[PDB]
């Protein structure tokens, strides 16, 4: 694929919907998020595309390379770990990211894996403690989605 | 990918969920739905996993080689003919199907698209209306979902 979408529901007022699109060796991402807390909030591609909990389901995050997580600019991060979003006052994010690890195809594609927004601020792994480096400790998942091709 | 699930839901009472396996040059899926009202529905894999406007941006049967729709026997057919899943008495449909044409990888694969359950019987492109040979006449979407990576 070239395009790709998700719908991020769960169940609390978080919704929004994003936006994938392959441009040379990178993906664009862009979108909104709305009903969360104004700040920031962790945004990450989750390994599975498994919606029968929740978003608990959906495992952890997508890292293929087995390494420990960072943040987007990080060496040191996991495929899935695309930093932090960040709501305003009115708790709308938008979103608008580029990144050159996640794909729409090929071995790092996240078709049919799940995005997640969470709960709190994402760390980059540079929290101090062992959380931090398996999750950055953005807590609970807000709303997720399974990534499928769009037009 | 060797796993796929799909979680369907939609504006009514109609939910979901099916499983998807390869097992050897083939693709088992299971699963059970309900909420349906007895008899036939059409289930079919649709092109987009696009929700964002609820089952309709799926767009139409997922359809690489250019055919009209038919039944999952004939050689006419779009890769998304699945045929029709039989509620019982209590609105139980059990989904037990082995399918030559739909894959969980490459040109002719699902993963990232959208299973429909339809609200009439799919007529397998027999009926002989124009929009027989589209939709099998198997009428609205009652639920779908995307179709996600599994475990
Ligand atoms: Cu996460
Ligand atoms: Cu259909
Ligand atoms: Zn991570
Ligand atoms: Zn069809």
Redesign the interface.
């Known amino acids: 694929?070239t395009k790709?979408?998700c719908?991020l529901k769960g169940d609390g007022p978080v919704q929004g919907?994003i936006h994938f699109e392959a441009k040379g060796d990178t993906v664009v991402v862009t979108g909104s998020i709305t009903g969360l807390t104004e700040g920031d909030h962790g945004f990450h591609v989750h390994?599975?595309?498994?919606?029968?909990q929740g978003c608990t389901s959906a495992?952890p995050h997508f890292n293929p390379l087995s390494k420990k997580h960072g943040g987007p600019k990080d060496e040191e991060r996991h495929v899935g770990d695309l930093g932090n979003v960040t709501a305003d006052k009115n708790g709308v994010a938008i979103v608008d990211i580029v990144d050159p690890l996640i794909s729409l195809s090929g071995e790092y594609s996240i078709?049919?894996?799940?995005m997640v927004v969470h709960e709190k601020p994402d760390d980059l792994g540079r929290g101090g403690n062992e959380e931090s480096t398996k999750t950055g400790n953005a807590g609970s998942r807000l709303a997720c989605?399974?990534?499928?091709?769009?037009?």
Chains 1, 2 share one sequence.
Do not use: E, H, P
């Open positions: 694929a790709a979408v719908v919907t390994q599975f595309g498994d919606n029968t495992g078709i049919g894996r799940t989605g399974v990534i499928g091709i769009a037009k």
